[PDB]
Symmetry: C2
Subunit: 132 residues, 2 copies
């Protein structure tokens, strides 16, 4: 998918309200936003800071990609998410987020972009796990 | 991401024409739909049939997931696609797809959906490839 700048949405009259009322949470460096389990469910967006999305297995970590400011992710991918800096997120449950999306579909490309990014990573990862 | 039913859109007045003008092509069981080094850019949607998506290196094919009636995909994922049965597709180029998307945002959910499954499939592939 194309790149996506979240600001073309937030600066626009359709977008500016998108996160109104989303709760705010701060994540200490080193802290786990998500474990591959029952964190809960919900979507969040990185306000500032930086998070690492990775997998394990054989007790070994594979980095997939990083989530910096403006990036959207969820609590249910089954990936691990840990803060590498103190980072702030806005969050809401799946349902509120769905609502907002249908009222401002242009903001759906951000979701498209983050899946594209996480997809290309995994694929490149897979190529590399084979070249040995 | 949420599951997507393309009929919801195609039956909507909003989206009934979405594939107007797309061209039709028939691939016979066994034929390659995508290479890596083909360098043609485009989107297609499966009308009927079944395609397999996989990657290759070191002469080891690895299957990721499959595409069936209603699923969308592209010619630039670097992924390799072969028809496991007689499969009819509709296609156009990225530009034309974009336009149709601008005009009918609800259809982007099918993009979110296919990127979505691709993601989950590649992850287990990784989870798998490691207990190995
Ligand atoms: C329909 C299913 C699609 C899939 C599975 C997909 C997947 C991908 C992947 C894996 C890449 C990584 C490029 C690489 O391997 O080097 C990519 C790049 C790209 N794709 Fe898509 N894509 C899809 C649809 C689209 C659409 C609809 C558009 C445009 C409207 C698009 C435009 C682009 C662009 C511009 C890039 C390069 C992004 C960059 O600058 O890094 N793709 N896509
Ligand atoms: C924002 C980035 C997101 C990513 C990377 C993502 C990824 C995933 C993954 C990997 C799964 C399967 C988990 C498993 O392996 O069991 C899943 C399931 C699911 N997610 Fe998401 N998701 C995202 C956002 C969303 C959003 C915005 C919604 C809104 C409805 C949503 C709703 C669902 C639903 C309903 C399922 C299970 C239903 C099905 O079988 O497709 N997710 N998602």
């Amino acid at each position: 998918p194309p790149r996506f700048n979240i600001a073309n949405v937030l600066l626009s009259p359709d977008g500016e309200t998108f996160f109104r009322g989303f709760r705010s949470k701060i994540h200490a460096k080193g802290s786990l936003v998500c474990t591959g389990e029952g964190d809960e469910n919900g979507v969040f967006v990185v306000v500032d800071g930086r998070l690492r999305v990775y997998l394990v297995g054989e007790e070994r970590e594979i980095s997939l990609f990083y989530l910096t400011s403006g990036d959207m992710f969820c609590m249910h991918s089954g990936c691990l998410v840990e803060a590498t800096e103190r980072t702030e997120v806005r969050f809401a449950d799946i349902r509120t987020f769905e609502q907002k999306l249908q009222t401002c579909p242009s903001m759906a490309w951000g979701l498209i972009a983050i899946l594209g990014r996480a997809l290309t990573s995994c694929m490149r990862t897979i190529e590399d796990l084979m070249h040995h």
